[PDB]
Write a protein that binds this ligand. Structure first.
Ligand SMILES: Nc1ncnc2c1ncn2[C@@H]1O[C@H](COP(=O)(O)OP(=O)(O)O)[C@@H](O)[C@H]1O
Ligand SMILES: Nc1ncnc2c1ncn2[C@@H]1O[C@H](COP(=O)(O)OP(=O)(O)O)[C@@H](O)[C@H]1O
Length: 203
């Protein structure tokens, strides 16, 4: 089963993907996580992507399409988390899947208001060592766990990321509606409740 998680930054896509991957057996592909690793390792991809990421802009399509091809599994259960983010990316994904004899089975839209995701992003914290994601209110780190705030989780960058989502990524909702595989998740609820919706959609 191939899943696409679509929705604004901070909707909880990574959080749901990690739990679903562990409990139900999916490979989790997060373009955000992979890009951040590239920046940290100072690869040619990382050095180019950094400037876009830090300003809340999308990384150019050709770079992202290559990234995904590099980590594409042969078949089986996959969650695409934060990919595609543009129509060109969605077209490219369809092509990649086709050449592997695969197709997108469900696109889950994580529907949630901007005020909800602003609080989620502003309070998001990461353990730079384990990569585990926390939230200063909704999932605080335990005593003794050092965390950091991502550079792109600052207020002006959150604003830009949401504008970019509405401009370039939101059109994918109707792209996938036309194909008849879009399913709406209410992502404004607590983690367990969103997870049960995800499981209800995919069975
Ligand atoms: N599919 C993609 N296309 C273009 N840029 C991307 C893509 N995925 C991630 N990025 C870049 O990485 C940043 C953070 O990725 P994102 O998916 O928002 O991860 P997170 O939601 O955990 O912040 C984006 O704002 C953008 O700069
Ligand atoms: N349902 C939820 N309710 C409250 N906070 C959440 C929920 N899901 C995730 N979070 C927190 O919100 C932030 C964003 O979650 P994340 O999974 O990184 O979103 P995305 O991958 O869509 O950007 C994180 O700090 C996370 O701990």
């Amino acid at each position: 089963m191939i899943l696409v998680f679509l929705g604004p930054p901070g909707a909880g896509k990574g959080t749901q993907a990690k739990r679903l991957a562990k409990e139900k057996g999916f490979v989790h592909i997060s373009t955000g996580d992979i890009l951040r690793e590239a920046v940290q390792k100072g690869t040619p991809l990382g050095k180019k992507a950094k400037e876009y990421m830090e300003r809340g802009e999308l990384v150019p399509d050709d770079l992202i399409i290559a990234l995904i091809e590099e980590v594409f599994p042969k078949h089986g259960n996959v969650i695409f988390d934060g990919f595609p983010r543009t129509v060109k990316q969605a077209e490219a994904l369809d092509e990649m899947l086709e050449k592997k004899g695969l197709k997108v089975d469900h696109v889950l839209l994580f529907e949630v208001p901007d005020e909800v995701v602003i609080e989620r992003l502003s309070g998001r914290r990461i353990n730079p060592e384990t990569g585990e994601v926390y939230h200063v209110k909704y999932n605080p780190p335990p005593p003794g766990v050092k965390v950091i705030q991502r550079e792109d989780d600052k207020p002006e960058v959150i604003k830009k990321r949401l504008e970019v989502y509405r401009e370039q990524t939101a059109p994918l909702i109707e792209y996938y509606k036309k194909k008849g595989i879009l399913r709406i998740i209410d992502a404004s609820k607590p983690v367990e409740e969103v997870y049960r919706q995800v499981l209800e959609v995919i069975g």
